[PDB]
Every structure is written in structure tokens, then in C-alpha cells.
Design a protein around this ligand. Sequence first.
Ligand SMILES: COCCOCC(=O)Nc1cccc(F)c1
Ligand SMILES: [Mg+2]
Lengths: 150, 151
Amino acid sequence: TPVEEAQQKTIEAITKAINYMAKRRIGALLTIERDTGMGDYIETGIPLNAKVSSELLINIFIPNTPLHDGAVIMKNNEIAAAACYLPLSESPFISKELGTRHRAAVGISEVTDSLTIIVSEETGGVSVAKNGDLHRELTEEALKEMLEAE
Amino acid sequence: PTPVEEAQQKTIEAITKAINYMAKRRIGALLTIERDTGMGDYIETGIPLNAKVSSELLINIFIPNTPLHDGAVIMKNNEIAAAACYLPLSESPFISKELGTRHRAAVGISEVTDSLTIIVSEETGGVSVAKNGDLHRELTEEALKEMLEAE
Ligand SMILES: COCCOCC(=O)Nc1cccc(F)c1
Ligand SMILES: [Mg+2]
């Protein structure tokens, strides 16, 4: 169906952008709103309400640019805003070598049903936060499986 | 001011802030503002954004060596319609010989539309505008803003 084709196109755009950033070790933080509304966090960023593309996702996260600091939040198959604030987790069970991007992802996942993707600037490793847990060192296939399951 | 007028002012402020930032850093840029002649054919050649304007997004689009930086951004009213768009190249002899493809594309679209295109030179940081087949170079910040307000 059209709804199904659109969801698959968005998954492909996300995974292509994540692969590019993982290869270049570009830090990234991408939260996908689900049933819990995240308007309060969307409002802290720069409004985009843009069509998803791998190109736009990559351009947003380039280091030392206006939009790269903070989270992209996606809602209703669009990029709602960039450079958004997310709350930092205080969980003592996050790997101690991880920094604020990962703590922000876990933090939003503690108070919403959202799915957040993180690319590490240190290693290019890809992780996902959901339900208060961080799933680390994902393969491309693992991330795709999580997006399709979501 | 009406909301339409306020939105137009917000969009002009976003554009001028972005152009000033890129000019200072010699970031090449090509930004076409659709007017009454529709530019759908050219919009459809690029990557669709249909995004709210911000200075931040305009700057992020044109950063060198990124997916969206080559080609034109085309704006429709208060939105960035698409990036990395094709525009036709002018053959006008009144384009300074040292100028490259962004300036020629800007003049080219200006010959077949009533659009206003802004160009930032990656060589000099100079700012120019193409309208109605003419290129006006080395604009001050004030001159650009006045041209946009008049547009
Ligand atoms: C040019 O292709 C680059 C692909 O990089 C893949 C890579 O190193 N890490 C990676 C990418 C996507 C998801 C994931 F869990 C991990
Ligand atoms: Mg002069």
C-alpha cells in the first residue's frame, strides 16, 4: 500500500544516512516520535517540517554547522525539527565511556515510547535507545530490524 | 502588519542572515526565490524538502562537500521547496568571464522566469543577484535586503 511504501522509503533514507555518518564518525541523534507526544521537545529546536531524505539527514548533522547540535525529531513521516533538546538520563547503567548524546537518547526513551538512533563521534558505532535501555554496536541489519519492528 | 507581511519579514531576515554567514566564509550558494512564474519543472529536478525557512537550514544546505550543496535551492514563499536543483545556464555575454556555473545558472533562470536569484561566490565571497536576465554584483548587505524587501 501507499502507507507501507512510504514507511519503507523512510526506513531506507534513515539507514542510508546512518551508514554515511557511521563511516565518517559523525555524531548524530535521531528520535522517532511514536504514541507519546513529543511536542514539548520539538518546540525546543529549529522547525523544519521537512520531507525525509538521506541527503537532508546527512546535511543536518555535519559537524560545526548550525543544526548539528541536538536531536532531530521525526514525526508523521517528516523531520519535525532539528537541534532539539532531549533530557539527559541519570541511569547508572549506561556504559561509562559514552557521552551526552547517548545519555540524551536514553533520557528521552525513559519518558516516551520513542525510538532514538545514535551515531558515536568517537567510533562511528550505532546504537538505539528504547524503554530506558541502550542497544549498542548494531549492524545495519540489526538497525533495520528495529526500525521495521517499531 | 498582517501575518503575511510578518512572515515575509521573517523569511527575508532568515535569507539575509544565511547569505551574510556564507559570504563571510566564502561558502558558494545559489538561492532562487520563485515569484509569479512557476518553477515546478526546476523544483522537481532537486531533492524535495518542502521545509520551513530558517537561516540555520539554508547554511547547512550549502556546506561544501555535502549531499545538498551543489545546485540551486528553490524557495516558494516561506518554504524551501527543494535543494540541489538544476537551472539552465545563460549564454549572456554580460556575465563576467571569471564567473562560474552558479552565476551562469542564476542568470539562466532569470531569463525565463521573474524569479530573484542570490549567488555567493566561493572565490571572493561577493554577493550578486540575477533578475530579468541581468546580474548585479558586489552587493552590500543593505542593498541585498532592500532588493528582497522590494521583491
Ligand atoms: C559506505 O557505507 C558505510 C556503512 O557503514 C556501516 C557501519 O560501519 N556501521 C553501521 C551502519 C548502519 C547501522 C549500523 F548499526 C552500523
Ligand atoms: Mg558595483
